Amino acid sequence: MFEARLVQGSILKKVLEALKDLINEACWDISSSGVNLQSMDSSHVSLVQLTLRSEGFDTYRCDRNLAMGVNLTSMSKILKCAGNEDIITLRAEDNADTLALVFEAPNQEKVSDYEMKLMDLDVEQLGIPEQEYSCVVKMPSGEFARICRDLSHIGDAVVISCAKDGVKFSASGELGNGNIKLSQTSNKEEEAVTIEMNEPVQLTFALRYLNFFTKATPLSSTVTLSMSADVPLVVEYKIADMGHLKYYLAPKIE
Amino acid sequence: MFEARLVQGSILKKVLEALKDLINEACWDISSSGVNLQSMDSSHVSLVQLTLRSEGFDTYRCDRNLAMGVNLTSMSKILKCAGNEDIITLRAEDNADTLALVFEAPNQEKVSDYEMKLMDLDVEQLGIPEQEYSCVVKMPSGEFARICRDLSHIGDAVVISCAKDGVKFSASGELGNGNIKLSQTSEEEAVTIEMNEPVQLTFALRYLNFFTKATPLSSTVTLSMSADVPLVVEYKIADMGHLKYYLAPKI
Amino acid sequence: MFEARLVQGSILKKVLEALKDLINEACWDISSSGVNLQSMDSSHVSLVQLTLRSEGFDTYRCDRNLAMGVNLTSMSKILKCAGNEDIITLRAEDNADTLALVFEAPNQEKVSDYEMKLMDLDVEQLGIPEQEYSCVVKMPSGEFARICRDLSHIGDAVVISCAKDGVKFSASGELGNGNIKLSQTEEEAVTIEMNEPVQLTFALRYLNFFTKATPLSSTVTLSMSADVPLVVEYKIADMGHLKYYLAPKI
Question: Containing H/E element for A161?
Fold first, then answer.
């Protein structure tokens, strides 16, 4: 039997809003350490890696490890039926082919109860080579969202250039070029930009895919980009006090 | 000569939004007792019944019993031209084939008047019986809207089961099935159940989500159910009249 | 080398929102007096004239006059990359075929730096003959915008009746007709400089393009006369104006 209770229901709503369009179907690896998802996008280019640690749940109890195949688009629609301040509880038996989802209200006079059919999936977990990185920019998620959206109307590709003073995002297409430049900051609040830099890095990335990652933006005030040459970029969102949601993306070659 | 003058113009705007895409043509029944409207939707599944009593207007006056037919799309387009705290005066003079709408702003600087054309309609007054029902459930309207909206993700129909403890809503479809449950309370956000016998009926959410366009008119809604008879979703237009929606259960 | 620095960048974002759908391509006249743009619309019905005097730029330099052709849609997309509180700075070289724009966040350590392509353009500069007007109305920009938006549902053309008491807007179509009548006189204040009474007809389709300029000003002026086009002026305060000229029906 599996039964994880989560008081911040919104966390789960937000995660599935991020992923549903990027990935159609995925295998939710449950264990006593918690919930994990790892999958490539429909078009096999970006890797996604969710970690919800069991510590982070109010109540958690998994006995056997599960490998629940889920249509995320389906799971998303059901999470719409939860309010943002609802307490959510997931639950499952081994020889049932159904994840159950229970939404308790904050007024506490309403209780929703859904049952989501699962599916059988053909999933490998790839090796994410756990690394140290040349550059690691930590900045506001809203700002990075802005930068990625704005440059989409200039070009298809962004060149991230990382140095000690700051980071630069650049793009080129049919109507000109553009050049966004952020510097390190602060003594002011958590709208702060910071860099832990070992070597300079310059890498080109697909803006189409980065704009898919930024659907995660409402999880976290801040976002960490980690880079090194000839290895994937890691856009990371802390699901604070619980885990993270990481998008991996390889740069372009020439 | 007809002339009603409503201070809460908003009430008139809200009613037209609740109707205009459920119904494209209907006959307004004007009288000394107030304004009534009875109609069925474009495709004959649901029956709407409006009531706005003469007492509920500021000024009220009706010489004869007019029956003006109105393209509701065109009328809603005119009520777009009125602000929310505007004062709406309806007026029809003798044998002109047109309804006038006058808008006066709360500041009173701006004054706007509109001449809408009428159309000839085929009036069969299906005056369905004033029944008394097995279960009568009284609950927040916005809560009722959320429930109908959500369960559409799940399926095409909603099963409304009723009891003394609480009302229950259920739906099934391709992706799985769902089951929302409202328990009874001990004043404005209160949930209450006048239950003679237990009920369990099944309705098309498509139509329920047309009814809930009427949710601006009231903080609460009263659902009325009985076996093999039509459901009544009633938004009160408080101290003024009501707006009832009728819908039959499924095969 | 030209270089104009505007602290209220938003002005420029708003100007291009008010123009991009009405005119696709346009020629910007850069001189020591400021920035001017005069051009006819897509379908050759209405004239637009923009002025931004050099005084209103917090820094301004122009060593030689310029005629930059600009695809206003392209430019509208580049300006979308600027925050409402950014300091925008236009800049052009001796004789390059690019305009450089520079967006600086007022405080927060962010400079965006764009470079837009230009294009060759033979446009006919039409001299605007300065006229005396019979009526000139001053009303709230947002109320004129509300009116042309509302009457759009009733008919395709609006009749503007200007008396000393107030000003009347009317429209007729299939579904019916409507009148909106405004008195004379606070912030929302209608006020009329009346010489001779006027009543003229105008395409609402074009008015509702002009009113996209509404974010530039709390007030808007209408200036009418018979056998001569309507002037819808939006003041870009302490700087210049955006004027739309439109000829009437019949």
Answer: strand A157-162
- How far is it, in rounded angstroms, from Cα C96 to Cα A100? 65
Chain centroid to Cα A73, Å, comes to: 16
Sheet holding A25-30, edge to edge: A66-71, A25-30, A34-40, A46-53, A243-249, A233-239, A222-227, A135-140, A194-195
C74 three-state secondary structure: helix
At residue B173, φ and ψ (nearest 5 deg) are -165, -170
Residue B194, domain CATH: 3.70.10.10
The answer to whether the CB atoms of C71 and A151 lie below 8 A apart is no
Closest chain C residue to B98, measured at CA: C176
- Expressed in Å, this structure's resolution amounts to 2.8
Domain of residue A217 covers 1-254
Tokens 């099934």 correspond to B172
- Write down how long chain A is: 254
User: Cα–Cα distance between C69 and C84 in angstroms, integer?
Assistant: 25
Q: Are strands B34-40 and A157-162 parallel, antiparallel or unpaired?
A: unpaired
Alpha carbons B8 and A138: distance in angstroms, whole number:
53
* DSSP reduced 3-state for B121: coil
Query: How far lies C108's CA from each of A144, A194, C112, in Å?
Result: 14, 13, 12
DSSP state of A252: P
Q: Report the number of distinct structural domains present in chain A.
A: 1
Partners of C193 in beta bridges:
none
Using the beta-carbon criterion (under 8 Å), do C178 and B110 form an inter-chain contact?
Answer: no
Helix or strand run (H / E) with residue C13: helix C10-19
Residue in chain C lying closest to B72 (CA): C175
Q: Which of C180, C185, C192 to mutate to test the interface with B (most CBs of B within 10 A)?
A: C180
